[PDB]
Amino acid sequence: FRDEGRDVLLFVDNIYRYTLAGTEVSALLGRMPSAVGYQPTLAEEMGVLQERITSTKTGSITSVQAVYVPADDLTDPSPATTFAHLDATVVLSRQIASLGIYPAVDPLDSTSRQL
Amino acid sequence: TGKIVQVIGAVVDVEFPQDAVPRVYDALEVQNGNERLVLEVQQQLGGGIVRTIAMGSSDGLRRGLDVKDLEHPIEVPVGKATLGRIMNVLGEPVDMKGEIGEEERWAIHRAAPSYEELSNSQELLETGIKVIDLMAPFAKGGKVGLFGGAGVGKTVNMMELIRNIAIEHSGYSVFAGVGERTREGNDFYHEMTDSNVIDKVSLVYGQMNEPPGNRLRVALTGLTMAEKFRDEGRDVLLFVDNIYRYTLAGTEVSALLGRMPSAVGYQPTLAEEMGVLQERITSTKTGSITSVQAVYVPADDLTDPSPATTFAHLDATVVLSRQIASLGIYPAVDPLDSTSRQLDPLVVGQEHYDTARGVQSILQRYQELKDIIAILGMDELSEEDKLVVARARKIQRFLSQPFFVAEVFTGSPGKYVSLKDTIRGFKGIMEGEYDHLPEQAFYMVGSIEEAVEKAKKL
Amino acid sequence: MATGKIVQVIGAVVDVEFPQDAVPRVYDALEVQNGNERLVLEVQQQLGGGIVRTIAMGSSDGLRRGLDVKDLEHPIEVPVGKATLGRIMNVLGEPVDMKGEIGEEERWAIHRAAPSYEELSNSQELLETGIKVIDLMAPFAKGGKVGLFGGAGVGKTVNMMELIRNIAIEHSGYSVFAGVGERTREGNDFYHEMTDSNVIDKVSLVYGQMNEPPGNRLRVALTGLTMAEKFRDEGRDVLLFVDNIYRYTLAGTEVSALLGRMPSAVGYQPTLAEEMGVLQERITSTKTGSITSVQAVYVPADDLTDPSPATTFAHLDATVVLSRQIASLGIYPAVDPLDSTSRQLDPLVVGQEHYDTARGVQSILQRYQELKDIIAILGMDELSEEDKLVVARARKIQRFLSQPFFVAEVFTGSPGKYVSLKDTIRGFKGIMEGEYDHLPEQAFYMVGSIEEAVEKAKKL
Amino acid sequence: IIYDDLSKQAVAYRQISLLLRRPPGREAFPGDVFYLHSRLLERAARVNAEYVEAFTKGEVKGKTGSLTALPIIETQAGDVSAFVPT
Amino acid sequence: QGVVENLASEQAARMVAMKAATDNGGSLIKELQLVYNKARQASITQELTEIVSGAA
Ligand SMILES: Nc1ncnc2c1ncn2[C@@H]1O[C@H](COP(=O)(O)OP(=O)(O)OP(=O)(O)O)[C@@H](O)[C@H]1O
Ligand SMILES: Nc1ncnc2c1ncn2[C@@H]1O[C@H](COP(=O)(O)OP(=O)(O)O)[C@@H](O)[C@H]1O
Ligand SMILES: [Mg+2]
């Protein structure tokens, strides 16, 4: 749709399980394991996916992506690597939600490069 | 008819002709100089190779020694003749008395009793120790486990249980010494013989100096004997000195058997090794086994996979803690983790249940106040939080008790507290009717009477 | 004639195939021509088939499979003795300064055996550094190990230069400096600061710069150690400075990891304690001479339980702590008297007078710290006469811990002073017991002996 | 359906894997332990009446079927961070 | 007069109480740091055991 010259929305319901399917595959491909049990190629695989999702001089893709952060850690390699690629970041927090407030967005960790 | 072809630590590989290869768990035999050595088959490898664990010292083995194939498992003496005597893992007499005049021998590898054969009982079996009975009542024919780190009292508690349970038990008993101190067993044996109760106890010893195979298979042997006395229709008491060593022996052997490590360096088959032993130490419609198992926990870590999987196999679990022992409070049971399947209103009555839950509620609230007490001290508590702290401290002290087996340490006379006395005492303390005594009055006193009396002595 | 051939090149690890009857021994040194430069390889493991696995003491780039490897029948050998004083060398004992070829009376192998039992000194002598804080509060055993727990910016290097100077002048010893894992910038200006202070002629320098491969950095420590062993065998008492022992531990970890051995503890090499013991047990007092060592220590994550500190602390005898706060007071050297300690402070080895004096000044300074908190919250009005006496004597003691170095004349302009142990003991004895209460505290500051304190006071 | 201690299933699949010498993963669990529980729990569904008519070959019309799952998991001192709980 | 003296007594009592609280807080820091460092070392050991035992 982009190369036809259109402006399109791409909604991806969770990017984490792309990396996680990659991990399950990687174990049996004979790749030597990496930190936190992840594949060696984690950043490469993520980059090969995210770089295609852009707006060019011929057309525009607008992208909204959910990412699962395990255990709310926000610090293990898969959430860490995915932060680099995004223009707008909204980090929902279990703590705010638990107190009963929706949306659970943390204003101290959420921002956009349009601000 | 077979030849030794590799020797790795306690593990020995033997080659046999293709038509003569042993079955799994068959017993082989080797001349090791002037000694006789028994090997137990663990695995069949390709090409007539068979891999075994030495039930004895591996030192002095060459390659090329001839191995003899005994075509049966390890089989042990069994029945009324095994009573009052001490035996090897291989069923050999280790006391200096003569031969065991056994009429029957059983193989130590057996199938567990069927689900159709099992039985259930609600009968409370009173134990003298005050804390165990109130917090975690134990019924006859069930399993009890004492969890604790190094040097927290899980052997001594079992000796008090042996004393108190033997008061109201008439039948035979079996004791399995698995990977523990030889001195504890020697002292036990002479206590039994000097009190003439030895005529009713059968003992198997596999203590911690013996090579891994002995310590691994000694537990199974003891179960074989306990199962004989069950299957005669009797009721039997089975004491296991340390079940942790049994899993650890498997760990020590596991990597040499050519198996990838699991979790924190453990053998991948840990859960099945524990289950296959635990499921045959059980009651049946013909007879019942009552068992107490000491469960060592490494590095005081109650989340370690071996203790963790042991928890699921027990009816009453008493959890000892070093923090309480360091405060002088013995027996050092943690009331906020010790539990029993029998603590039900239907089983023990509404008073027995309400008192225990009040004790737990009060203690649990004591825990939550400790952080503010730590930072700011007690004067910033609410005026009834102070009262909760006072009653919780009194309760903590009254859980302590003098033991008849601790006279060698405390010097104080021992105490036995019946059920219709301890729940009365704790109910009164909870309701505040004895709140006026000082904290020290409750330390190491048997009953509420002895506490008020001790308060008269300040 | 060369007789081995390279089989593999994987990073710093290089494998070599020799004839079956000639396989070089462990820690033997080998040479190859890597282009138009020679490259030295150190043998680590003798694998099957006649293949030895080595580590390149230099960049392993440009090596081809099938090069010819020449078998030196000895370990790496370095020059030793007086000809090395004032020079700068790399791992291999080659000059990295531009002053040219070294005299090379003798060349010695870095891999050497340790002193044996019947060779150890049957006595437990002390070393008189001449610095008041150190000789009073943290005395050095002759042949002991000392740990310097301070970050850069507080006077580490000036302390080191003062010890070099005093051991060269007031004794007849030389020093060896081993710059393990040192930034090149520092090496350059440490060299400048020693040459512009006339101590350079009395110290030998070996630098392992961080841009060097892990094999280089690890063996740099051993090179300095063997040069110190030569000065010991000549009958002297010698000082060996290690610029960071933690870097030696980490170089060992990196090499062990490259060779593929299974890790231990918190990811360290399995041979950690052995490698530390191999280094530290050579530094001892023998029946001919001694090597005393002062070693800078870095504690990972500020964690004193980590295996590197836990292994290093097994070997240290004394412990010198440098304080940012003390330095801010204008007090130099910035040693902290309450955290610096030595296991030589016992009456059984140091005597009852010295022990009771050190214990006394420690007690006074500690009580002063508590009283200074009381003053901070409630002013001086709370103090009794006894408290005011304690505070006054504590201030005089604290001033008296300062000293002018022969190296510090550039800044203070005051002549440097070397203070004998007896003078230090007498000074703190007197100040503790109420003598010299009649002259002001600034008479004690930066002066020297106590006699010099009173003679400063007379016109202050 | 009440699956009881699905964790005591995961230990079992791990035992099979490590005895079969497959490459181990985090906490030594097999990599494909997510796929085990994922393809077990996704069977719990509510199915529309057209699926029920197509399956029963028209014998049952106009009724939806359902399977409700209640898995049980054990935590080591409550740490949700563990591999199987997560 | 009694009121003013009780106010001064309040200030002194709060002073000593806050002294005790500060010391107890520091003494709790020194225990939490041992717990933290032991957990740090254990986590590194376990992860590296999984990685090395994971290869081949
Ligand atoms: N009731 C008690 N009163 C006082 N001390 C006790 C009591 N129970 C146990 N202890 C103390 O515990 C010590 C060790 O007892 P025990 O052998 O039962 O411990 P353990 O945890 O099973 O140790 P291990 O695994 O080393 O055998 C005793 O010597 C004694 O000091
Ligand atoms: N004895 C001393 N006399 C004067 N200044 C000193 C002395 N010791 C340290 N300093 C000051 O401390 C600062 C850093 O000293 P430096 O020798 O560079 O410390 P380090 O060796 O730790 O890097 C300099 O400003 C230096 O003047
Ligand atoms: Mg014991």
* DSSP assignment string, A34-67: -GGG--TTHHHHHHHHHTTS---SS-EEEEEE--
Amino acid at C174: Y
Residue the block writes with tokens 């702290």: B389
What is the residue whose two structure tokens read 């199938």?
Answer: B111
* Contacts of residue B395, Cβ cutoff 8 Å, sequence gap at least 6: B359, B362, B363, B426, B429, B430
Judge contact between B177 and B18, C-beta under 8 A.
no
CA distance D31 to D14: 10
With 0-12 / 13-18 / 19 or more C-beta atoms within 10 angstroms meaning exposed / middle / buried, residue B306 is: buried
Q: Which of D8, D18, D77 sits opposite B260 (nearest CB)?
A: D18
- Residue among B321, B409, B444, B445 to mutate when testing ligand 1 (max atoms within 8 A of CB): B409
Q: How far, in Å, CA of B428 to CA of B445, rounded? A: 16
* Resolution expressed in Å: 4.0
| Burial class (CB within 10 angstroms; exposed 0-12, middle 13-18, buried 19+) of B28 | buried
For residue D56 the two structure tokens come to 């029963």
Query: Which 3 state secondary structure label does DSSP give C430?
Result: helix
User: What is the distance in A from the centroid of ligand 2 to the CA of C367?
Assistant: 29
Beta carbons of B8 and B35 less than 8 angstroms apart: no
- Residue C344: count other Cβ atoms within 10 Å of its Cβ: 20
With b for 16 or more beta-carbon neighbours within 10 A and e for fewer, the B397-419 pattern comes to bbbbbbbebbeeeeeeebbbbeb
Angle (nearest 5°) at CA C234 between C228 and C238: 40
CB atoms within 10 A of CB B271: 20
Axis crossing angle, helix A16-29 with helix D34-41, rounded to the nearest 10: 130
Catalytic residue among C17, C42, C128, C182: C182
CATH fold label, B350-456: 1.10.1140
Rounded CA-CA distance C97/C85 in Å is 13
Q: Which two tokens stand for residue B160?
A: 């008090």
Supply φ then ψ for residue D73, to 5 degrees.
-130, 145
Residues B408 and B419: their CA atoms lie apart, in Å, by 26
Q: Which of C53, C156, C247, C396 is catalytic?
A: C156
- The residues, any chain, with a CB within 8 Å of residue B277's CB and separated by 6 or more, are B219, B220, B223, B246
Cβ-contact B86, B64 below 8 angstroms: no
For the four alpha carbons of C257, C262, C266 and C269, in that order, the dihedral sign comes to negative
Residue that is written with structure tokens 């007539």 in the block: B48
The residue type at E19: K
| Residue C274 a catalytic site member | no
**Residues C319, C139: Cα–Cα separation, whole Å:** 9
Give the Å distance between the CA of A69 and the centre of ligand 1: 47
Residue B203, classified by CB atoms within 10 Å of its CB into exposed (0-12), middle (13-18) or buried (19+), is buried
Question: Whose CA is closest to atom 8 on ligand 1?
Answer: B153
Number of residues that this document lists for chain B? 458
- Please name the residue ranges forming H helices in B88-238: 130-135, 154-168, 182-194, 212-231
Phi, psi of C13 (to 5 degrees): -95, 130
CA distance C202 to C168: 7
How far apart, in whole angstroms, are the C-alpha atoms of residue C381 and residue C383? Answer: 6
**Start-to-end C-alpha separation, chain B:** 79
- Whether the CB-CB separation of B351 and B137 falls below 8 Å is answered with no
| Minimal Cβ distance to B271: which of D11, D21, D27 | D11
Task: Provide the CATH number for the domain formed by C78-342 in this structure.
Answer: 3.40.50.300
- Tokens 């610090």 correspond to A75
Contact B400, B414 (CB under 8 A): no
List the one residue out of C266, C263, C248 whose CA is nearest residue C307.
C266
DSSP string, C214-283: HHHHHHHHHHHHHHHHHHHHTT-EEEEEES-HHHHHHHHHHHHHHHTPPPBTTTB-TTHHHHHHHHHTSS
Find out whether B398 and B429 touch, Cβ atoms under 8 Å.
yes
State the catalytic residue, choosing from B40, B75, B160, B180.
Answer: B180
For domain C352-458, which architecture applies?
A: Orthogonal Bundle (1.10)
Q: Which helix (H) or strand (E) holds A77?
A: helix A77-83
User: Where are the strands (E) in D1-86, listed by range?
Assistant: 46-47, 65-66
Q: Is D77 within 8 Å of B303 (Cβ atoms)? A: yes
Architecture per CATH, domain B2-75, reads as: Beta Barrel (2.40)
**Cα angle for residues B79, B80, B81 (degrees, 5° grid):** 90
The tokens describing C112, both together, are: 């050497």
Q: Could you tell me how many residues make up chain E? A: 56
| Sign of the CA dihedral running D7, D41, A11, A42 | positive
Q: Name the H helices within C122-213.
A: 132-137, 156-169, 184-195
Total length of chain D: 86
Distances (CA, A) of B113 to B116, B421, E9: 8, 39, 76
B260 Cβ under 8 Å from any chain D Cβ: yes
> Domain boundaries in chain C?
4-77, 78-342, 352-458
Q: Quickly tell me which residue has 């170095």 as its tokens.
A: C405
Closest CA relative to residue D84, chosen from A40, B305, A94 = B305
Measured distance CA(B182)–CA(C378) in Å, rounded: 65
Contacts 24+ apart (CB under 8 A), B38-44: B38/B74, B38/B90, B39/B12, B39/B14, B39/B67, B40/B74, B40/B213, B40/B217, B42/B257, B43/B257
Look at residues C332, C13, C282, C344 and name the one whose alpha carbon lies nearest to residue C146: C344
Collapsing DSSP to helix, strand or coil, A19 comes out as: helix
Using CA atoms, how far apart are residues B158 and B293, in angstroms rounded to an integer?
A: 9
Q: What are phi and psi of A35, to 5 degrees?
A: -65, 140
Structure tokens at C415: 């002549």
Q: Concatenate the DSSP letters of all residues of B314-375 into one string.
A: -SEEEEB-HHHHTTT-SS-B-TTT-EETT--HHHH-HHHHHHHHHHHHHHHHHHHHHHHHHH
Q: Report which residue type is found at B426.
A: F
- Tokens (6 digits) for C181: 């894992």
- Name the token pair of D43: 């069977």
CA atoms of E4 and C250, how far apart (whole Å):
65
Cα three-residue angle B346-B347-B352, rounded to 5 degrees: 90
Q: How far is A79 from chain E (nearest CA, A)?
A: 19
Topology classification of domain B76-340: Rossmann fold (3.40.50)
Q: Which residues contact C353 (CB under 8 A, 6 or more apart)?
A: C425, C429
Technique used? cryo-EM
Q: C264: exposed, middle or buried (C-beta count within 10 Å: 0-12, 13-18, 19+)?
A: middle
Local structure of residue C199 (DSSP, 8 states): -
What whole-number distance in Å separates Cα of residue C312 and Cα of residue C259? Answer: 24
CA distance B278 to B276: 6
Amino acid at B74: I
**Which one, of B418, B425, B415, B413, lies nearest residue B452 by Cα?**
B425
- Residues A94, A96, A97, A99, CA torsion sign: positive
Topology of the domain comprising C4-77: Thrombin, subunit H (2.40.10)
Got the DSSP string for B376-397? H-GGGS-TTHHHHHHHHHHHHH
Strands C51-56 and C68-71: unpaired
CB–CB of A70 and D26 under 8 A? no
Under 8 Å between Cβ of B427 and B355: yes
Rounded CA gap, D11 and B273, in Å? 13
Angstrom distances, CA of residue E44 to CA of C263, C264, E33, E49: 11, 10, 17, 8
